[PDB]
Amino acid sequence: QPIDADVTVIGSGPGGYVAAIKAAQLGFKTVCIEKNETLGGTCLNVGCIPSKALLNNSHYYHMAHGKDFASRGIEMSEVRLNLDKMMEQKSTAVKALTGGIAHLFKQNKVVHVNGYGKITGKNQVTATKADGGTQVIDTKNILIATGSEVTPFPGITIDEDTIVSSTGALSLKKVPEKMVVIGAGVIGVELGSVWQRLGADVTAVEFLGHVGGVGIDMEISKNFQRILQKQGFKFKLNTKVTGATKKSDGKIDVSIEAASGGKAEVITCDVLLVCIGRRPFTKNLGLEELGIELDPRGRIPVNTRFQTKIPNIYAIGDVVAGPMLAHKAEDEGIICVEGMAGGAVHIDYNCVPSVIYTHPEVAWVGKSEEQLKEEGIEYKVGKFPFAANSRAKTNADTDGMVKILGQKSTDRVLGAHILGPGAGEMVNEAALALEYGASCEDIARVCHAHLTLSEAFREANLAASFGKSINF
Amino acid sequence: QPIDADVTVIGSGPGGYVAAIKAAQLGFKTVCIEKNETLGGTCLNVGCIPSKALLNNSHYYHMAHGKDFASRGIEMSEVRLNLDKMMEQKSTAVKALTGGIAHLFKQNKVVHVNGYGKITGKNQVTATKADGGTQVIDTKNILIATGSEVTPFPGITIDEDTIVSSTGALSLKKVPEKMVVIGAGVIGVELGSVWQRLGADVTAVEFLGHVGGVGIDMEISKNFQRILQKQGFKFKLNTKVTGATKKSDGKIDVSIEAASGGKAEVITCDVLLVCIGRRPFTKNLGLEELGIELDPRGRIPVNTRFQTKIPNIYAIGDVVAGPMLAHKAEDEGIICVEGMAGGAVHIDYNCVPSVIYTHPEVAWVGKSEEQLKEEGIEYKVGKFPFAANSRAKTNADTDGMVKILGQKSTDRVLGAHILGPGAGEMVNEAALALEYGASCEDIARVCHAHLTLSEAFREANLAASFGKSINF
Numbered sequence: 001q002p003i004d005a006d007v008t009v010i011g012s013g014p015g016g017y018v019a020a021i022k023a024a025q026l027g028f029k030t031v032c033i034e035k036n037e038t039l040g041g042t043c044l045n046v047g048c049i050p051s052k053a054l055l056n057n058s059h060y061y062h063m064a065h066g067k068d069f070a071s072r073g074i075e076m077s078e079v080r081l082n083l084d085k086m087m088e089q090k091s092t093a094v095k096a097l098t099g100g101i102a103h104l105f106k107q108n109k110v111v112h113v114n115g116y117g118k119i120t121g122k123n124q125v126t127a128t129k130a131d132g133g134t135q136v137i138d139t140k141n142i143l144i145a146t147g148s149e150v151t152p153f154p155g156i157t158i159d160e161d162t163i164v165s166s167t168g169a170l171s172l173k174k175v176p177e178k179m180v181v182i183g184a185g186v187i188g189v190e191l192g193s194v195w196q197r198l199g200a201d202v203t204a205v206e207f208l209g210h211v212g213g214v215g216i217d218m219e220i221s222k223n224f225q226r227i228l229q230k231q232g233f234k235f236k237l238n239t240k241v242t243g244a245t246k247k248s249d250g251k252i253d254v255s256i257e258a259a260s261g262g263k264a265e266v267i268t269c270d271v272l273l274v275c276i277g278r279r280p281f282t283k284n285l286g287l288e289e290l291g292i293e294l295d296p297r298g299r300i301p302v303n304t305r306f307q308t309k310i311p312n313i314y315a316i317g318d319v320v321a322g323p324m325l326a327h328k329a330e331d332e333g334i335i336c337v338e339g340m341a342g343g344a345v346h347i348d349y350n351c352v353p354s355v356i357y358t359h360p361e362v363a364w365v366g367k368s369e370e371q372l373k374e375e376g377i378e379y380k381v382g383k384f385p386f387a388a389n390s391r392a393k394t395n396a397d398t399d400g401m402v403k404i405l406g407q408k409s410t411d412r413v414l415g416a417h418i419l420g421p422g423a424g425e426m427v428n429e430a431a432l433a434l435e436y437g438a439s440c441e442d443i444a445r446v447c448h449a450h451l452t453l454s455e456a457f458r459e460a461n462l463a464a465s466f467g468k469s470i471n472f
Numbered sequence: 473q474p475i476d477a478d479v480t481v482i483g484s485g486p487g488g489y490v491a492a493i494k495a496a497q498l499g500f501k502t503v504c505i506e507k508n509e510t511l512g513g514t515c516l517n518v519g520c521i522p523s524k525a526l527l528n529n530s531h532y533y534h535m536a537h538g539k540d541f542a543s544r545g546i547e548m549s550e551v552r553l554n555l556d557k558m559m560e561q562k563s564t565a566v567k568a569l570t571g572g573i574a575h576l577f578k579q580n581k582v583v584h585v586n587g588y589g590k591i592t593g594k595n596q597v598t599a600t601k602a603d604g605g606t607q608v609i610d611t612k613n614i615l616i617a618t619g620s621e622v623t624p625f626p627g628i629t630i631d632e633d634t635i636v637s638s639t640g641a642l643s644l645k646k647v648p649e650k651m652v653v654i655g656a657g658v659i660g661v662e663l664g665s666v667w668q669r670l671g672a673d674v675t676a677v678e679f680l681g682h683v684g685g686v687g688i689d690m691e692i693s694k695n696f697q698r699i700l701q702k703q704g705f706k707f708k709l710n711t712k713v714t715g716a717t718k719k720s721d722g723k724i725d726v727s728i729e730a731a732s733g734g735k736a737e738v739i740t741c742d743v744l745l746v747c748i749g750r751r752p753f754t755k756n757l758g759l760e761e762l763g764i765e766l767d768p769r770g771r772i773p774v775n776t777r778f779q780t781k782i783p784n785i786y787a788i789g790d791v792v793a794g795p796m797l798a799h800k801a802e803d804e805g806i807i808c809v810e811g812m813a814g815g816a817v818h819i820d821y822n823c824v825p826s827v828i829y830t831h832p833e834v835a836w837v838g839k840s841e842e843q844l845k846e847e848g849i850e851y852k853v854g855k856f857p858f859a860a861n862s863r864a865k866t867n868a869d870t871d872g873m874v875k876i877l878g879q880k881s882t883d884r885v886l887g888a889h890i891l892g893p894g895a896g897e898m899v900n901e902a903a904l905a906l907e908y909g910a911s912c913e914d915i916a917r918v919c920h921a922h923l924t925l926s927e928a929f930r931e932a933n934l935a936a937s938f939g940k941s942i943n944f
């Protein structure tokens with residue numbers, strides 16, 4: 001059973017499976033190790049894919065069940081939710097995407113190994129199967145892509161039945177009457193918005209003073225919060241959770257308090273969602289025997305070439321430092337594999353966008369106003385509301401705005417922050433501009449197609465550069 | 473009552489009203505003259521705005537009335553069309569956009585003169601009102617933005633009742649049982665697609681050998697045609713219309729033959745849509761008395777500052793050469809007015825995008841394969857199908873692809889052509905790339921937000937640059 005490889009990838013997540021494919025394309029004999037039943041890691045199985053599927057489906061449910069479709073001349077007697085059918089469509093997307101990775105591995109002649117991976121030597125990886133079966137691989141370089149896992153709340157045991165994490169919250173069998181989310185981060189706000197649309201009464205409790213996680217612009221966060229409240233999403237900010245106990249009748253009691261201290265309360269809910277964070281996963285990887293020490297938060301220290309302390313062992317994705325996003329792990333996998341083949345390795349995390357797929361969407365890349373103030377950077381602001389964008393008005397969906405942050409002297413774009421329709425696609429134009437160091441005037445002078453949401457992005461850059469836009 | 477002005481703009485369409493606002497913001501005393509009851513010209517009143525409104529409205533009708541919403545767990549007993557309510561939604565959007573132009577003229581202190589403008593001298597414009605009153609404007613500069621009108625078909629009379637132009641097709645009071653469209657250009661394909669979704673039996677008769685107009689890539693046109701045909705849109709290509717007769721029964725008989733000439737045939741329809749094109753509009757503007765001769769197609773010849781043969785008289789928009797598009801006219805108005813203030817004037821018609829708002833959408837910018845072969849340019853092709861895009865599969869909407877055309881030696885992007893979901897927004901990123909002269913590798917190396925349709929644009933550039941993509 002011995003196999004020999006040039007590169008051995010542990011984990012089949014976005015970082016792991018993309019890194020594996022690129023290595024084969026570079027000419028390396030490549031092996032990939034996955035312990036779970038399917039390829040694709042967190043994002044495809046319990047992450048991006050199922051959550052975005054329910055966000056899109058719940059959004060169309062809201063459009064038909066509400067007043068939107070009636071205003072367009074689409075008349076329906078009565079709209080019913082079929083949660084089982086909605087969940088199967090989610091499952092059909094997960095199944096096609098997880099299955100696609102195996103087909104991509106086969107097309108590129110990438111060897112798939114089923115089992116739990118352990119690095120037993122400098123040039124050796126051993127995969128153990130479920131039955132006790134064993135697989136040893138002799139390889140020159142190792143790439144660690146073991147990813148992340150849920151962060152447990154100390155003193156709450158998640159049973160994935162009525163006190164749930166992101167995984168269980170994605171597969172609820174019926175709509176809860178009242179739901180509590182622990183943490184108003186990107187994950188909590190998306191999942192809470194799904195169940196809010198489907199009929200649940202959702203309240204979010206957050207220790208910090210804002211929604212959307214770290215890196216989000218504060219003005220964007222407050223406006224995003226006001227819009228969600230108008231939808232029915234409730235928030236208890238600057239409040240801490242002390243404990244949660246499931247009562248005998250079936251209702252969970254969550255004890256909350258003001259984060260600073262005081263204002264004690266207990267809230268009861270049918271379903272409790274705990275998503276306060278994620279953390280790198282290195283359990284049973286045996287780093288100690290290799291001498292690879294973890295940082296205080298559990299990450300593998302790595303250098304700019306994504307080498308660990310041992311030159312032939314690398315680490316990428318959520319298991320190393322940086323923002324825990326799928327496209328971030330996908331890029332580290334590509335360049336790390338390119339670096340192994342002698343190529344250059346460079347990545348700018350300031351050019352990494354973040355997207356929240358609620359409705360309205362939120363997206364941003366680069367620096368926020370708070371970051372610029374802390375660094376002492378002199379900047380100017382350009383804003384353009386979606387109420388003045390022709391596509392948004394024609395659609396009758398005009399929440400939010402585009403905010404551009406530009407250098408005061410050079411007019412260079414330092415940050416783009418979008419709240420409203422089409423934020424996700426729009427931030428990609430912003431990332432391309434930041435990669436090139438483009439100015440606000442540059443974007444203002446590029447001819448944007450009439451009746452696109454991206455015209456708001458152009459006009460906001462015009463307001464930051466010229467001082468005024470045309471349509472507002 | 474004579475008025476003194478620095479700039480006098482004739483026409484309040486996208487070129488005219490944008491040029492008027494920018495000139496006022498630049499410090500000029502500005503006057504804008506409009507003969508029609510509302511501001512906004514063709515695009516806002518009978519053009520982009522009402523057609524795109526009906527396109528998205530009929531699209532939502534097709535998903536609710538069709539198989540899409542039922543597969544997402546959204547269950548409805550009976551879906552019925554209320555055409556008057558749908559036309560009401562269209563009219564409400566037209567009224568909000570035209571009214572917004574009046575407010576922007578008020579905010580920027582644009583003098584709005586209602587009436588028919590005529591150039592009565594080199595530095596004089598005379599507006600004649602409906603009641604015969606006259607308003608004389610003594611002005612330093614004149615800007616002609618008199619726009620376009622529908623091209624009449626020789627031997628066919630349009631009454632806007634059962635033989636209609638685009639204007640009449642936008643306000644039909646009943647879904648025709650059968651409709652024939654003369655012209656399979658961008659306008660014809662959109663309007664035909666709207667009425668096809670609402671129940672019409674639609675056939676388009678096109679003189680050329682492809683659908684989508686001039687400049688569209690042939691491979692994209694053939695694939696776009698195949699998808700529309702499977703939706704039920706029928707096409708008779710390389711076919712011209714020789715005549716149309718209103719029969720006694722109330723149905724129109726359309727006589728057709730091969731565009732080059734051949735055996736005649738008859739097809740019958742309830743409503744005939746004539747959109748074979750549009751032509752520049754300069755009627756009774758006083759060009760003959762000034763010495764401004766028109767070109768063979770009716771356009772005003774202008775130099776790089778958009779000046780006519782008379783240096784202080786300018787022309788922009790649909791009345792001059794170049795793509796007859798709203799964002800093309802808006803940009804010409806901006807730079808022309810900036811040139812009047814001494815600034816540089818630059819527009820690259822190769823970087824001006826084109827969008828068709830069907831479902832699937834079509835969008836492109838730069839050069840097609842035919843143009844590159846015609847120019848003798850050695851290029852390489854990168855393609856990525858939307859079937860391999862994670863966002864498309866999660867949505868279950870995977871028609872089409874992204875095709876990138878790159879220079880064979882320098883890897884520089886020469887053209888981007890998108891057929892599928894979100895092409896309209898995606899093309900604006902492509903326009904910025906062309907503006908900077910980006911390479912395929914540059915775009916592939918920019919970090920695109922995961923779960924966006926724009927990832928297909930990135931991977932198509934990776935396929936063109938490296939030779940292979942990751943997920944296909």
Ligand SMILES: Cc1cc2nc3c(=O)[nH]c(=O)nc-3n(C[C@H](O)[C@H](O)[C@H](O)COP(=O)(O)OP(=O)(O)OC[C@H]3O[C@@H](n4cnc5c(N)ncnc54)[C@H](O)[C@@H]3O)c2cc1C
Pocket residue numbers: 010011012013014015016033034035036039040041042043044046047048049051115116117118145146147148149166187281283284285316317318319324325326327328329922923
């Ligand atoms: C609900 C949810 C929604 C999300 N939505 C988004 C979103 O919209 N956009 C975004 O950018 N990010 C999103 N994320 C984050 C995203 O999923 C992660 O950033 C990404 O999956 C990290 O990829 P990775 O390869 O580094 O780790 P993972 O995706 O976790 O992959 C790790 C893989 O390695 C395997 N593995 C682990 N240890 C071993 C071992 N010892 N031996 C063998 N195999 C092993 C695991 O089984 C797994 O298959 C979301 C996350 C969640 C939970």
Ligand SMILES: Cc1cc2nc3c(=O)[nH]c(=O)nc-3n(C[C@H](O)[C@H](O)[C@H](O)COP(=O)(O)OP(=O)(O)OC[C@H]3O[C@@H](n4cnc5c(N)ncnc54)[C@H](O)[C@@H]3O)c2cc1C
Pocket residue numbers: 450451482483484485486487488489505506507508512513514515516518519520521523524587588589590617618619620621638659753755756757788789790791796797798799800801
């Ligand atoms: C059905 C349809 C759909 C379209 N969809 C799109 C689309 O999605 N995207 C796109 O980019 N383009 C689209 N177009 C094209 C777009 O409408 C035009 O390119 C654009 O309107 C041109 O702007 P303009 O200012 O040059 O001219 P116009 O819009 O024609 O405006 C000219 C104005 O000047 C006025 N005028 C003329 N002569 C005089 C005079 N002597 N005195 C006073 N007033 C005068 C006219 O009444 C008119 O209001 C569409 C066109 C149609 C017909």
